[PDB]
Design a protein around this motif. Structure first.
Motif, PDB file in Angstrom:
ATOM      1  N   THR A 282       8.409   9.372  11.932  1.00 39.00           N
ATOM      2  CA  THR A 282       9.068   9.405  13.233  1.00 39.00           C
ATOM      3  C   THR A 282       8.100   9.082  14.360  1.00 39.00           C
ATOM      4  O   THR A 282       8.509   8.628  15.431  1.00 39.00           O
ATOM      5  CB  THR A 282       9.707  10.764  13.492  1.00 39.00           C
ATOM      6  N   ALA A 283       6.812   9.306  14.119  1.00 39.12           N
ATOM      7  CA  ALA A 283       5.797   9.009  15.116  1.00 39.12           C
ATOM      8  C   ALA A 283       5.499   7.519  15.201  1.00 39.12           C
ATOM      9  O   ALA A 283       4.897   7.060  16.177  1.00 39.12           O
ATOM     10  CB  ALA A 283       4.530   9.773  14.775  1.00 39.12           C
ATOM     11  N   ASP A 284       5.898   6.748  14.187  1.00 36.67           N
ATOM     12  CA  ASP A 284       5.456   5.368  14.043  1.00 36.67           C
ATOM     13  C   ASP A 284       5.854   4.489  15.215  1.00 36.67           C
ATOM     14  O   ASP A 284       6.853   4.749  15.889  1.00 36.67           O
ATOM     15  CB  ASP A 284       5.998   4.767  12.746  1.00 36.67           C
ATOM     16  N   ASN A 285       5.066   3.445  15.454  1.00 33.64           N
ATOM     17  CA  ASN A 285       5.336   2.467  16.494  1.00 33.64           C
ATOM     18  C   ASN A 285       5.272   1.084  15.875  1.00 33.64           C
ATOM     19  O   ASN A 285       4.203   0.646  15.441  1.00 33.64           O
ATOM     20  CB  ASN A 285       4.333   2.590  17.637  1.00 33.64           C
ATOM     21  N   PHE A 286       6.415   0.404  15.843  1.00 33.62           N
ATOM     22  CA  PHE A 286       6.538  -0.903  15.227  1.00 33.62           C
ATOM     23  C   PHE A 286       7.419  -1.782  16.098  1.00 33.62           C
ATOM     24  O   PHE A 286       7.996  -1.334  17.091  1.00 33.62           O
ATOM     25  CB  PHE A 286       7.134  -0.804  13.821  1.00 33.62           C
ATOM     26  N   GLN A 287       7.518  -3.046  15.708  1.00 34.54           N
ATOM     27  CA  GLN A 287       8.392  -4.015  16.356  1.00 34.54           C
ATOM     28  C   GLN A 287       9.671  -4.068  15.540  1.00 34.54           C
ATOM     29  O   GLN A 287       9.691  -4.609  14.433  1.00 34.54           O
ATOM     30  CB  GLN A 287       7.742  -5.388  16.437  1.00 34.54           C
ATOM     31  N   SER A 288      10.733  -3.508  16.092  1.00 34.28           N
ATOM     32  CA  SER A 288      12.006  -3.456  15.411  1.00 34.28           C
ATOM     33  C   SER A 288      12.885  -4.627  15.828  1.00 34.28           C
ATOM     34  O   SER A 288      12.667  -5.235  16.878  1.00 34.28           O
ATOM     35  CB  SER A 288      12.687  -2.140  15.725  1.00 34.28           C
ATOM     36  N   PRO A 289      13.893  -4.970  15.022  1.00 31.77           N
ATOM     37  CA  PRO A 289      14.745  -6.116  15.354  1.00 31.77           C
ATOM     38  C   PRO A 289      15.864  -5.709  16.299  1.00 31.77           C
ATOM     39  O   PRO A 289      16.621  -4.779  16.020  1.00 31.77           O
ATOM     40  CB  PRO A 289      15.289  -6.547  13.992  1.00 31.77           C
ATOM     41  N   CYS A 290      15.976  -6.422  17.411  1.00 29.04           N
ATOM     42  CA  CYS A 290      16.925  -6.063  18.452  1.00 29.04           C
ATOM     43  C   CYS A 290      18.329  -6.488  18.058  1.00 29.04           C
ATOM     44  O   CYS A 290      18.545  -7.607  17.587  1.00 29.04           O
ATOM     45  CB  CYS A 290      16.518  -6.705  19.772  1.00 29.04           C
TER      46      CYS A 290
ATOM     47  N   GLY B 160       2.336   4.625   1.820  1.00 27.90           N
ATOM     48  CA  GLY B 160       2.870   4.694   3.158  1.00 27.90           C
ATOM     49  C   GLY B 160       3.793   3.541   3.456  1.00 27.90           C
ATOM     50  O   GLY B 160       3.887   3.110   4.610  1.00 27.90           O
ATOM     51  N   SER B 161       4.484   3.046   2.441  1.00 23.89           N
ATOM     52  CA  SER B 161       5.404   1.934   2.561  1.00 23.89           C
ATOM     53  C   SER B 161       6.815   2.435   2.317  1.00 23.89           C
ATOM     54  O   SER B 161       7.042   3.319   1.488  1.00 23.89           O
ATOM     55  CB  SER B 161       5.062   0.832   1.570  1.00 23.89           C
ATOM     56  N   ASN B 162       7.758   1.877   3.065  1.00 26.58           N
ATOM     57  CA  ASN B 162       9.146   2.313   3.059  1.00 26.58           C
ATOM     58  C   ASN B 162       9.301   3.776   3.462  1.00 26.58           C
ATOM     59  O   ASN B 162      10.297   4.413   3.099  1.00 26.58           O
ATOM     60  CB  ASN B 162       9.786   2.068   1.694  1.00 26.58           C
ATOM     61  N   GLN B 163       8.334   4.322   4.195  1.00 26.34           N
ATOM     62  CA  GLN B 163       8.437   5.650   4.774  1.00 26.34           C
ATOM     63  C   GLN B 163       8.786   5.503   6.242  1.00 26.34           C
ATOM     64  O   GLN B 163       8.268   4.612   6.919  1.00 26.34           O
ATOM     65  CB  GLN B 163       7.132   6.436   4.604  1.00 26.34           C
ATOM     66  N   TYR B 164       9.667   6.368   6.726  1.00 28.55           N
ATOM     67  CA  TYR B 164       9.979   6.440   8.145  1.00 28.55           C
ATOM     68  C   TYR B 164       9.208   7.623   8.696  1.00 28.55           C
ATOM     69  O   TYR B 164       9.628   8.773   8.572  1.00 28.55           O
ATOM     70  CB  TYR B 164      11.472   6.568   8.395  1.00 28.55           C
TER      71      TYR B 164
ATOM     72  N   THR C 205       0.834  -1.189   0.000  1.00 28.64           N
ATOM     73  CA  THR C 205       0.000   0.000   0.000  1.00 28.64           C
ATOM     74  C   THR C 205       0.871   1.243   0.000  1.00 28.64           C
ATOM     75  O   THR C 205       2.092   1.171   0.151  1.00 28.64           O
ATOM     76  CB  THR C 205      -0.911   0.010   1.221  1.00 28.64           C
TER      77      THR C 205
END
Lengths: 222, 231, 193, 193, 193, 60, 60
Positions: free
Chosen positions: G15-23, G9-13, G7
């Motif tokens: 700054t407000a976003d909340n996601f599960q990032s890789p540690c 809004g893809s590959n956009q950063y 869709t």
């Protein structure tokens, strides 16, 4: 005084208290080959070695040591594959006035280094470290010797106990293997604390190895 | 199809990442394992082994057999200890090379206790007393036998027991300690003094040797791996 | 013993580690030598960190999650343009024959699995399983007649290219599901170079 | 008290905030200095907004969701072309050794996690957890012998490049799961520059 | 009989295997011959590995998971630039008419399924099912009046291109769901070339 | 939509891979099979057959 | 595989976003917390404190 027996052999142990089983696994048959536990499983006592002050260490491979040793040595030539655990009694009989210590290290895959078969395989006489001859405090491979105490091992400290016992299970990548080619185990006896003794006492105490191959089983006989 | 939204952190190879990758040999039937004796499940098992402290790391003695033996003569009986071993297990050069120290050179932090063991490798006839002191962190090491005695210690009668174990305890402000501190010696000072000069009978060599061993205790643990091996 | 996990064998070994940098060239018809393809027998005995870690122990089993990071560059300043290249990353399993020419029979062979990595996409990845004939990889073997993990071969698939394009492929081996046996005194960092 | 959430500690702190702009260069063989790689010790003590917010309180714990926004550009008008670069973004954890050369041993080390970000893709991202030796980050510590979060090192992986390509990497630290303790009079904006 | 699977008929046959390299050109208006499109009747009788494997047996059924690996390159050093091309990969089923010109009626025909593969993306793929009139493909047929799997035609869709761009399409046939019947003495590798 | 994260090993054609590909003939009704005698299920069945050792491999 | 549709809004950063990032430190075992006295849960707690109005803000 525990007097142990295996067929046509007999041994005089102090008592089997300070007996180390390597890696906490007792020798077991494979859970397919024949098991000549009839008479090949006996005490083969190698030719004693003299520990002088200047000694740096000794070593044997297993079962290359027991290659000319009777039925086990026969089995191990006329069969193609075999596997065997062992019981190595290192008796070191000295008076109360000699002092020193020996680290007896059973070593899996004891690849030594100063290369050829006759050179890496001394047979029953064993080889000796030196300060070819591998480096004593390295065991050939550039090791610090204190770290050696990770190996299944036992100390023979002459003030206290004068004999060690190592019960070695069969350690190998394979379930069974050719013994003529590949030595699973390796025994190295290095003097941790050097020999010393009172003025005119016996100036070279002896060390004797007694090797009972436990749970040996072979395949296929030519 | 299902509408998705590619987030940031996409098409990045994070070396730490854990994913399900596609196997190149999908049909291959793996050689099953066997019960080889001696399976290790944790590196700390190798630190719970009593390896051997090298005490004399002088140019001559070092990298030989002699670097592990501490010689006990009956020469002029001075109060300075037989040995004083600082327990900065990775920083102290002596304990740095033990298997404990080897595993601790692979980790940023550690905690727990250390059991030391001193083994008398002298005559069965020899008798005497060695005082095995342990100064705690911050305390400068003892210089005289009395100072050491007043602290924690163990009088060890050579005649009776031929070895002597001592479990140095865990003490730290933090939950762990760095292995490369701020160049600051802390914690241990395992000293060994003569309480009595060694007694020997007839023409028995007055020069004995003692060995020293060290192992992490059960409580011991490490964290934050740090590989540094390089060429 | 506060959650000793971090020193578990998995946590200890299972880390991405660059084991090799394989360099290949674009099949330009100018004077390109046999650098058209790169070959490398998978072996830990060159990287010191992983070697030293494995040689703590005598035997081992482990899957192997290789990852490939390809990066290219025009050789001369005659850059101009050049279309996005594709790389064939063939994993020749043990006992199989290794390539010798750019277009040997081996590259088309069904047996040898192969990745076709397009440049400028996410890094490629396979997971070699345990490919040992033994029931464990032997790091030290006192015996007579080393173990095989395979070969990785890499080439550029494109053919009639006007500009030369060098390209290095970093292989990031991460041993996975490791089990090890029979600890040993660790070899010293001193004798590896 | 109509849904006081917006002033909760999470809502207050957990916001994307640029903490640094790290500039690196392409390994062109012309006269490129030691700008080939960039290094930056993670620290809030340079950014004023986050600093001033944290220094409301004495102690804190927080994970750290760093995000990387890489943007490149040809240096001179000799643009011509240049293939899509890849950037190694290594996060050196606390107490570990920091890189010194472009190709130091540290870049290949297993310990240091590393991202391989291809240009023109979605921004890279890791989540450093709480890496404190203490049970809380101390912003003010009346005592004798500051806390460590790590280092970020960044380089271009490509090697034989004909054209120089500068590139800035914006690090967007977003502290996550913050807890704080012992409020304090907020320092004045006056004394930070 | 330790998990004889690896020699099961599926494991034996179902492997990606390059069956052809189809070369096409960009419709440049300079002197481009009828190489503007490529055509190839799907047939195992040219690849020796798959042929020899199938000719172990007399009859067979199998789906067919063709995969296409397209790789292009500028012909002359007049590279300059050229926009990302699109390729029409038409699978003409059995008994249907094959293309003859670049823009024959067949390319627009509803019947013939077609892929529109953009360059520099993931490899295209279709799965032809069993298209046999018989209930099994006959590899040997003692009789009077060979079987049809179809044709693959490939072209570049773009038209007014200033620079020529050659492009090779590797077809990677992987027979899927194979069943075979009536084993036979395997033909010798000797007589295939 | 559903936020996804493209992992490594994406847009790679691993020849070994097994996936669900889109069929070019979706409506086509396949010719059913039949019970041809002599179905092989495993190559080893062909090795459990007593073939004939050639002993004399001399030039003649 | 599963057909997806990227869709907008893809590959956009964002700054407000909340996601599960890789540690980056997946194996690292975090130092646990403790009960430090004085935990703040909301900034308004600091506004419910009676601070001190400065009335005379003259230059002197």
């Amino acid at each position: 005084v525990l007097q142990l027996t295996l067929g046509n052999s007999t041994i005089t142990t102090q008592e089997a208290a300070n007996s180390v089983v390597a890696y906490g696994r007792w020798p077991e048959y494979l859970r397919q080959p024949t098991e000549p536990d009839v008479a090949a499983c006996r005490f083969y006592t190698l030719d004693t070695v003299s520990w002088t002050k200047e000694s740096r260490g000794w070593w044997w491979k297993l079962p290359d040591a027991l290659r000319d040793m009777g039925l086990f040595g026969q089995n191990m030539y006329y069969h193609y594959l075999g596997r065997s655990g062992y019981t190595v009694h290192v008796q070191c009989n000295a008076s109360k006035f000699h002092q020193g210590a020996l680290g007896v290290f059973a070593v899996p895959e004891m690849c030594l280094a100063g290369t050829s078969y006759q050179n890496a395989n001394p047979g029953e006489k064993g080889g000796t470290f030196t300060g070819f001859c591998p480096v004593d405090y390295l065991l050939g491979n550039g090791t610090l010797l204190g770290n050696a105490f990770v190996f299944p091992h036992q100390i023979i400290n002459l003030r206290t106990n004068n004999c060690a016992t190592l019960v070695l299970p069969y350690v190998n990548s394979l379930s069974i293997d050719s013994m003529v080619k590949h030595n699973n185990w390796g025994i190295a006896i290095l003097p941790l604390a050097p020999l010393n003794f009172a003025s005119e006492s016996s100036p070279e105490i002896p060390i004797t190895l007694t090797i009972a191959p436990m749970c040996c089983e072979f395949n296929g006989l030519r | 199809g299902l509408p998705v939204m590619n987030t940031p952190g996409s098409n990045q190879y994070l070396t730490a990442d854990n994913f399900q990758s596609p196997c190149a040999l999908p049909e291959f039937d793996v050689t099953p394992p066997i019960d080889i004796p001696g399976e290790v499940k944790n590196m700390m098992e190798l630190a719970e082994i009593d390896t051997m402290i090298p005490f004399d790391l002088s140019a001559t003695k070092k990298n030989t057999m002699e670097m592990y033996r501490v010689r006990l003569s009956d020469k002029p009986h001075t109060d300075d200890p037989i040995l004083c071993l600082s327990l900065s297990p990775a920083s102290d050069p002596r304990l740095s090379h033990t298997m404990l120290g080897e595993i601790l050179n692979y980790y940023t932090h550690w905690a727990g206790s250390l059991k030391f063991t001193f083994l008398f490798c002298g005559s069965m006839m020899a008798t005497g007393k060695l005082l095995v002191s342990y100064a705690p962190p911050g305390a400068d090491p003892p210089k005289k036998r009395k100072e050491a005695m007043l602290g924690t210690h163990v009088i060890w009668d050579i005649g009776l027991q031929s070895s002597c174990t001592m479990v140095v305890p865990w003490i730290s402000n933090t939950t762990y300690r760095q292995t490369i501190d701020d160049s600051f010696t802390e914690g241990g000072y395992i000293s060994v003094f003569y309480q009595t000069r060694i007694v020997v009978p007839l023409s028995t060599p007055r020069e004995m040797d003692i060995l020293g061993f060290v192992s992490a205790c059960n409580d011991f643990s490490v964290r934050l791996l740090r590989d540094t091996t390089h060429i | 013993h506060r959650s000793r996990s971090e020193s578990s064998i998995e946590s200890f070994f299972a880390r991405g580690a660059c084991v090799t940098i394989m360099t290949v060239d674009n099949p330009a018809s100018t004077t390109n030598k046999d650098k058209l393809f790169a070959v490398w027998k998978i072996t830990y005995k060159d990287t010191v960190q992983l070697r030293r870690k494995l040689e703590f122990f005598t035997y081992s089993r482990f899957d192997m999650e290789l990852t490939f990071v390809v990066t290219a560059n025009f050789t001369e300043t005659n850059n101009g343009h050049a279309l996005n290249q594709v790389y064939q990353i063939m994993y020749v399993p043990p006992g199989a024959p290794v390539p010798e020419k750019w277009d040997d029979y081996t590259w088309q062979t069904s047996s040898n699995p192969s990745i076709f990595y397009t440049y400028g996409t996410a890094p490629a990845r396979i997971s070699v399983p345990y490919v040992g004939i033994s029931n464990a990889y032997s790091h030290f073997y006192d015996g007579f007649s080393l173990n095989d993990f395979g070969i990785l071969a890499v080439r550029v698939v494109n053919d009639h290219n006007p500009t030369k394009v060098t390209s290095k492929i970093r292989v990031y081996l991460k041993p996975k599901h490791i089990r090890v046996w029979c600890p040993r005194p660790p070899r010293a960092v001193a004798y590896y170079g």
